[PDB]
Amino acid sequence: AAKPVLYYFNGRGKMESIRWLLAAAGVEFEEVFLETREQYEKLLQSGILMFQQVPMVEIDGMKLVQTRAILNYIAGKYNLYGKDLKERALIDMYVGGTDDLMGFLLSFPFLSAEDKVKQCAFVVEKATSRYFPAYEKVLKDHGQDFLVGNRLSWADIHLLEAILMVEEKKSDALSGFPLLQAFKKRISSIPTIKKFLAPGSKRKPISDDKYVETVRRVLRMYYDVKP
Amino acid sequence: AAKPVLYYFNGRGKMESIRWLLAAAGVEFEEVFLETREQYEKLLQSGILMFQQVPMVEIDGMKLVQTRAILNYIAGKYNLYGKDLKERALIDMYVGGTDDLMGFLLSFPFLSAEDKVKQCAFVVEKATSRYFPAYEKVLKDHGQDFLVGNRLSWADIHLLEAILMVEEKKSDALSGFPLLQAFKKRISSIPTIKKFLAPGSKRKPISDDKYVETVRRVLRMYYDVKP
Questions:
Q1: Environment class of residue B121 by beta-carbon count within 10 Å: exposed (0-12), middle (13-18) or buried (19+)?
Q2: Which residues does the record list as Blocked amino end (Ala) (modified residue) (chains A, B)?
């Protein structure tokens, strides 16, 4: 092995969460961006994408595909997946919820101005009435700084990312969830994470129109993404 | 703990895969079906559905939500998840692909007759040009009876289910994938699985119109599911 290599577009997408996890773990990685269609075609005939898709990560000799497979592997390898099955079930449960929440924003940059507005509210309602109350309760019920095992876990990292994403759409969306507001502070303060949030890191920005173009050109898809 | 309880509609949905896994493991379970809207409302105020959704499974004291969390827990608990992280990464990768494939059929019973036809072909193309060739290669490359660790794993079980589902739409879809045809035989023969495929088991049938009705009534959603 050597240093993890993340193959994906130069933007957030489904790769962002993996960037977050590797960073929180203090793991340095290299990225190979998809800019041209010929590049993609070359990658396909190569046959290193088991199911003809990205994300794809070369780590410890393997060339992994399937976002959840990759994240799972990373959470286990760097001891951010709990101590046993019970603790891992909780982490998967929480991660599941923030994944669904984040999943509602995947197509956002591909929506029309009219849809972006409609989707924006949809996601805000989802987070404030469904997700945030659930995670707020987890913290309340055990009163510990972390979601699971009183120690940083993938779940915490995934939750933080989801929080900042919702806050990029509705800056005060977290208002009324004191525990998450304090959670947002604590987690954002952990050195590795703090560095990732800092300037010059590999954290990717909100996807703009160039991102969409590069995607539509290389994959020849998502031309008419609906809300 | 006691005996696992699966809360969900009396049909396939996202619960089917969990039924398959628990059965392959020789685990007996009880089911509580969602038939009325008031039933759902009662379940909600109860607050046992962390994110206000089903599937939900009560197992070993926990009330788990998030399909993947549940399956993950079940695969680990009954030693159908590999021996280490490397083997588990492979299983997650394979499962990921059959999950995406099966994911394309979730809304099928809610489609119009015109869409069902369109979706049917879409899924067939997906399985024959993308998925089946990939899994065929895994078997070819190591020439072992199982996908991972030369022993039955969740991945094998998930693959079989996906095969039979595609075959319920295009009976000869597996034609040209000798290795999967032999894989289909081997796996279908394992006693626990063989019993699940047999008559009188809890395996659920292809969702009909009554299924759709019961869903639309209890959840008040999926009224206009698009292709």
A1: exposed
A2: 1
| CA A215 – CA A222 distance, rounded (Å) | 8
Q: Which domain holds residue A24?
A: 1-80+190-227
Contact B134, A50 (CB under 8 A): yes
Put simply, whether A58 touches B (Cβ < 8 Å) is no
Nearest to A65 among B69, B72, B93 (CB): B93
Secondary structure of residue B5 in the 3-state scheme: strand
- Report how far residue A151's alpha carbon sits from residue A34's, in angstroms, rounded to the nearest whole number: 36
What total number of domains does chain A contain? 2
Residues A210 and A124 in one domain: no
Ligand-binding site membership of B98 (annotated) = no
Test A68 with B97 for CB contact under 8 angstroms. no
CA–chain centroid gap for A88, Å, is 18
Measuring CA to CA, which residue among B140, B155, B150, B146 is closest to residue B96? B155
Q: Which residues of A touch B74 (CB under 8 A)?
A: none
The residue of A49, A50, A52, A98 whose CB has the most chain B CBs within 10 angstroms, and thus the best one to mutate to test that interface, is A50
| CATH assignment at residue B220 | 3.40.30.10
Three-state DSSP state, A93 = helix
Are residue B207 and residue B224 in the same domain, yes or no? yes
Cα separation, B82 vs B88, in Å, equals 5
Do residues A52 and B96 touch, judged by C-beta distance below 8 A?
no
Is residue A195 domain-shared with residue A142, that is, in the same domain?
A: no
Which of chain A's residues have a Cβ under 8 Å away from the Cβ of B97? 50-51, 66
Chain B hits for A93, CB-CB cut-off 8 Å, are: 50, 64-66, 69
Distance CA B19, CA B27 (A): 9
- Check if the beta carbon of residue A73 is closer than 8 Å to that of residue B88: yes
B103 in reach of chain A (CB within 8 A):
no
Q: Within this chain, do residues B28 and B115 fall inside the same structural domain, yes or no?
A: no
- Tell which residue, B165, B158, B58, has the closest CA to residue B104: B165
| Approach to solving | X-ray
Please tell me the distance in Å from A135's CA to the nearest CA on chain B.
9
Between CA B202 and CA B197 the distance in angstroms is: 9
Same-domain status, A9 and A88: no
User: Per the annotation, does B119 bind a ligand?
Assistant: no
